[PDB]
Design a protein around this nucleic acid. Structure first.
Ligand code: ANP
Ligand code: ANP
Ligand code: MG
Ligand code: MG
Lengths: 36, 351, 352, 36
DNA sequence: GGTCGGTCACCGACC
DNA sequence: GGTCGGTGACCGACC
């Protein structure tokens, strides 16, 4: 879906960040040890 | 959340009821004190173990029941899975029991929770909303139709977020990310590299939990989708007169009347009902998959004959949806407009 | 409070309106957004300075109006005397001008108050009640019909008792007693017994009036019995002896009986609450005649089915008898045509 | 008539023996109040 | 009749 | 315990 929180958030960052690669990386690692 | 079957015994106005739910529209007809609202609070009490009308659980038991026992069995589906909640509220023994089991493809019942407190926590996980969000969006009780509309911006955003986010994920993510900063502070080239990690998690924390950033952006992006459908519903219903937008600064939902600005509380009875109903059927459309039911208990009586029929016309064009849509009314003028009926008198289903 | 005349320009959803109120029942009838409740908040505004729907005065100015100014003239009778209130709210200049005048028998207007606050203060002294009491008893707003009935105990008694006593009188009375007592003790054979004996009589009288425990309590109880007596009567007629009503403040408020089974007001259905609320209202209306001589019920017969709407309307008609200004507001033509005298509003103006 | 002060006269007479003296003092006070 | 200022009375405090 | 201090309500005058 369009109104998917983190898919919304994957994009809110790209506008507001250049270092959005390692940041969305960090976010992904974190969500994974929440998945676990 | 998709209601499938509901069995009630001796709950409030009810004596015995047994209802299959299905996609489409159903009107629940009936006089005053017939048991229409009881059936609504029933679903509410099946899931969240809270009702609308009473503070205390044992109040919900039909006082005429000779064994002082109200029993509820609710079966629902979410996201492919299928769940069964059984409840007994025994008012004499003062005992309240409650279990939630999963119903698996092989027809057995895997248990997930027993007792009220953990059933509610389990229900609130499976659904991804809390009770307040439930009754403020797609499950609108008698006399509380315009609560979302006239709410302050703070409340509105909380409600919207919750519908479209897991608070279970966010609660843990925020906590986990706290742990990984107080573990880096704990430490005391390595001290530069751990200073610069504390600071990249912190930029992440900020964009994600500052009130105040993405929450404000996300609410915007949802209400943008929601109000696009409402504006169109309002164009149809009022012939281009009413426009709706959302502003945090201007106190909440903000209505344009032939271009003129007015706070949602400025509106009248019918206009409020009319602009809560199109905002509610908009939310339900944008929340399909997440929220799969849409219930209204008596909006439509504020409304004059023109507006009642107009509102009925648009609502009827939801019949197509894969949604369990249920409206409740004593008004026969409204009810006759729809095909599938369920009549309730004296606490039982009739005919 | 007997509304005599009311004229409005640009308040809320109204353009122009000039209305002389009569005795017995009028029905105000008209579509969603006609301006029905707008007139209703106009009366409340003209007297107390407050709407129902907006915390801010300048929001009541009709935004279509080219001068950005709302004008209100309300004229009413209380206790033989006649008054007129003129209010101008200018949304553009952020100005609120209010003034109160007694209209003497000859017809000259003697000024009494000339500011929003001095007017509100004099109005409460005259009418006998604060704004909350007004909107919970006999002037019932759209969507607020059942607010007295499900109200918590301490409010219910503050409200019904405020009708029948005077905050103004009692406040002065208590102070003067406070001074006379102070002077006597300041003034400290037979004369001493006289000076000291009247000191005690004063104090024994002070104890009986102002220890909340004493007469104040008792008064509220006598008042309630009177109101509930009537309410029980109406309920017998309307529900074939099914529903009784009583008051217990340790039980959280008004308590209904259903064939003998106790049940707090908030537990009743939408229809049953409106039917019992109205009963309570009619009762208070009867019991405070001469003190409040108007009775306005806007949007109070929506969640009422056909059998109860017919039952409620017939009962309400049995007030047409009384010397009062009684007004019901509806958008439902069905309900409104059970009565004779209709006032039709569309587009913020009176029609027909 | 349900009048606050009428009811007090009845309430005081019930439980107070010096009431006739007391109601009298009240009347004088009510008068000094009405004057102001 | 509104406003603004003066004074006196009363409770608080420290003497 | 009595005296000194400050603040709070009523009243008359002036706008
Ligand atoms: N400040 C305002 N300026 C102009 N119009 C307004 C203002 N506030 C509200 N309105 C509109 O004025 C119209 C009359 O309002 P209202 O008096 O509440 O209607 P009503 O007759 O009681 N209708 P209803 O309660 O639905 O049966 C409505 O369309 C309002 O949206
Ligand atoms: N604890 C209780 N035990 C038994 N009856 C109750 C209880 N609480 C409420 N009732 C009654 O149960 C009946 C059904 O109430 P309810 O379900 O809200 O009616 P409804 O169908 O919504 N009528 P209406 O709102 O007027 O259209 C009413 O007569 C209530 O007063
Ligand atoms: Mg109901
Ligand atoms: Mg209205």
């Amino acid at each position: 879906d369009k109104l998917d929180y983190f898919e919304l958030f994957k994009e809110y960052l790209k506008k507001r960040e250049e270092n959005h690669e390692k940041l969305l990386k960090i976010l992904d690692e974190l969500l994974d040890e929440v998945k676990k | 959340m998709r209601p499938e079957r509901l069995t009630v015994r001796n709950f409030l106005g009810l004596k015995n009821v047994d209802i299959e739910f299905q996609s489409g529209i159903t009107v629940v007809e009936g006089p005053n004190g017939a048991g229409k609202s009881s059936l609504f609070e029933a679903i509410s009490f099946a899931l969240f173990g809270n009702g609308i009308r009473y503070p205390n659980s044992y109040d919900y038991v039909n006082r005429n029941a000779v064994d002082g026992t109200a029993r509820l069995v609710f079966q629902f589906e979410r996201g492919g899975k299928r769940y069964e909640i059984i409840r007994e509220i025994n008012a004499l023994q003062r005992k309240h029991n409650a279990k939630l089991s999963e119903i698996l493809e092989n027809g057995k019942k895997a248990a997930i929770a027993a007792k009220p407190t953990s059933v509610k926590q389990e229900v609130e996980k499976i659904l991804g909303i809390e009770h307040r969000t439930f009754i403020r969006t797609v499950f609108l009780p008698q006399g509380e139709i315009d609560k979302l509309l006239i709410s302050p911006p703070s409340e509105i955003t909380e409600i919207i977020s919750d519908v479209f986010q897991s608070k279970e994920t966010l609660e843990k993510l925020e906590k986990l990310l706290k742990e990984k900063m107080k573990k880096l502070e704990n430490e005391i080239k390595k001290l530069k590299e751990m200073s610069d990690e504390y600071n990249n998690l912190d930029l992440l924390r900020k964009y994600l939990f500052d009130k105040s950033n993405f929450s404000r952006y996300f609410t915007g992006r949802v209400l943008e989708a929601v109000l696009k459908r409402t504006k169109a519903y309002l164009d149809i219903l009022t012939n281009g007169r009413f426009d709706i937008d959302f502003d945090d600064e201007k106190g909440g939902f903000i209505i344009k009347d032939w271009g003129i600005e007015r706070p949602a509380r400025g509106l009248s009875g019918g206009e409020r009902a009319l602009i809560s109903i199109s905002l509610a059927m908009s939310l339900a459309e944008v929340a399909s998959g997440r929220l799969d039911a849409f219930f209204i208990d008596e909006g439509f009586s504020s409304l004059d004959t023109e507006n009642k029929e107009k509102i009925a016309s648009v609502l009827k064009e939801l019949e197509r949806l894969n949604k369990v849509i249920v409206f409740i009314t004593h008004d026969r003028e409204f009810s006759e407009a729809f095909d599938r009926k369920l009549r309730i008198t004296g606490g039982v289903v009739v005919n």
